[PDB]
C-alpha cells in the first residue's frame, strides 16, 4: 500500500502551502490600518487536523478552518489619522513578526521534507514495477 503515501504527502504539501500563505499574508499586513470593510486587519491562522475519516487509523493532514488569532489589538495613539477611535486609539493588527518568520521557515522545511518523501516513494514504486524483470 505505497500508493496511499501519494495522498498523505500531497495533503501535507497542500496544508503546509496554505499555512505558509496565511503566515505571509499576516506578515505583509503587519502595518495595515484598514480592511475592505473598514475593520482593522485581524491576524489569522490555520488549524491542522488529522485527515482521517471515522475508522481510519492514520492519515495525512488537513486544514480545518482559518481562525482569527487571539491577541490584543495593538493600540496606537494617532488622533490625527482619519481612522481613529473615540479617544484616538487606532487599532493595528496583532501580528507577531518573529512568530510569522519562524512559521514561514517551519512551513518551508516541512514542505521540503514531504517532497523528499514523495520522491523516494516514487522511486520505490518504479523499482517494485521492476520486480521480476
Amino acid at each position: 500500500a505505497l500508493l496511499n503515501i501519494f495522498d498523505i504527502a500531497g495533503s501535507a504539501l497542500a496544508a503546509q502551502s496554505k499555512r505558509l500563505n496565511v503566515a505571509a499574508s499576516n506578515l505583509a499586513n503587519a502595518d495595515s490600518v484598514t480592511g475592505p470593510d473598514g475593520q482593522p486587519y485581524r491576524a489569522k491562522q490555520v488549524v491542522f487536523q488529522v485527515d482521517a475519516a471515522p475508522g481510519q487509523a492514520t492519515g495525512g493532514v488537513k486544514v480545518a478552518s482559518v481562525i482569527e488569532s487571539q491577541a490584543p489589538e495593538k493600540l496606537v495613539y494617532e488622533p490625527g489619522n482619519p481612522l481613529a477611535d473615540a479617544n484616538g486609539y487606532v487599532k493595528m493588527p496583532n501580528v507577531d513578526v518573529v512568530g510569522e518568520m519562524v512559521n514561514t521557515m517551519s512551513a518551508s522545511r516541512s514542505y521540503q521534507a514531504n517532497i523528499e518523501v514523495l520522491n523516494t516513494v516514487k522511486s520505490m514504486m518504479l523499482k517494485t514495477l521492476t520486480l521480476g524483470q
Binding site: D96, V98, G99, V102, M105
Partner: protein
Amino acid sequence: DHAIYTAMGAASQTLNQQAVTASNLANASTPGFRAQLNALRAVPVDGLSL
C-alpha cells in the same frame, strides 16, 4: 526542530520586555508616575522522557 520555537519565544518575550522599557522611558516627564517592573519567568515543559 523545536528548539527554534524555544528561541523564538525568547526573542518575542525580549521584544515584549523592550516594549515595557520603552513605555517606561516615554514617561520620564509624566507627573507622579510609577515604573513597570519586568522579569522573565521560566516555564519548564513537563513530559517525557528527558
